[PDB]
Ligand binder design. Structure first.
Ligand SMILES: CCCC[C@H](NC(=O)[C@H](C)NC(=O)[C@H](CCC(=O)O)NC(=O)[C@H](Cc1ccccc1)NC[C@H](CC(C)C)NC(=O)[C@@H](NC(=O)[C@@H](N)CCCNC(N)=[NH2+])C(C)C)C(N)=O
Lengths: 99, 99
């Protein structure tokens, strides 16, 4: 599809059996998902942006469905104010910026 | 042009007559630039991100060239870890996310 930017680009994702809404963010290197009991091993991590850093748990090899497209990669889980799909996943679904 | 996301989507912008580099960011409502002198009246504002809130100066109706495409609108200047071109200006140059 083609997403215009008049409003935040929100899509439905399916992660670990749960369907959610996440922001497609070209300025995010990583994918950050809201607090959730995901099964599996994880590593403690810290990520930053505007305002500072937050503590997250890093899960690798996660499978996620972005608007009907499958991708597999690292997902960071923590108290983020919003679910964010970073470039790590965006590249796997062939997303581009056009103008 | 068509920009893939294997690398950060960085472009050269010009503001106040000074060249700069910035990140095309679909997950930002606004355009934030690192602290600099910009001619004009500005107002105190607060914006938030992944790590919290930061104080910025709001500059209304500023002229800016992004990758050679002209935009005129609000630019916020503050302690950002990276220069960011948000949706308010991305819409002005006709940018859309595609996949
Ligand atoms: C229109 C009026 C707005 C008023 C104002 N609005 C806001 O603050 C809105 C919600 N904020 C935003 O849109 C802000 C950007 C600032 C702005 O646009 O104003 N967006 C953001 O901060 C979004 C996340 C987000 C989006 C929506 C809601 C909440 C959070 N992140 C943008 C950000 C860009 C980065 C280069 C600094 N990316 C990140 O923070 C990601 N982090 C990373 O990718 C790290 N690996 C690297 C960080 C440093 N980068 C670098 N050196 N290149 C991500 C994994 C957290 C508020 N006061 O009410």
């Amino acid at each position: 599809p083609q997403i215009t930017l008049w409003k935040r680009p929100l899509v439905t994702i399916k992660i670990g059996g749960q369907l959610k809404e996440a922001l497609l963010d070209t300025g995010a290197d990583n994918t950050v998902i809201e607090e959730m009991s995901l099964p599996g091993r994880w590593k403690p991590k810290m990520i930053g942006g505007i305002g500072g850093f937050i503590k997250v748990r890093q899960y690798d090899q996660i499978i996620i469905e972005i608007a009907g497209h499958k991708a597999i990669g690292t997902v960071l889980v923590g108290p983020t104010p919003s679910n964010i799909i970073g470039r790590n996943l965006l590249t796997q679904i062939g997303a581009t910026l056009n103008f």
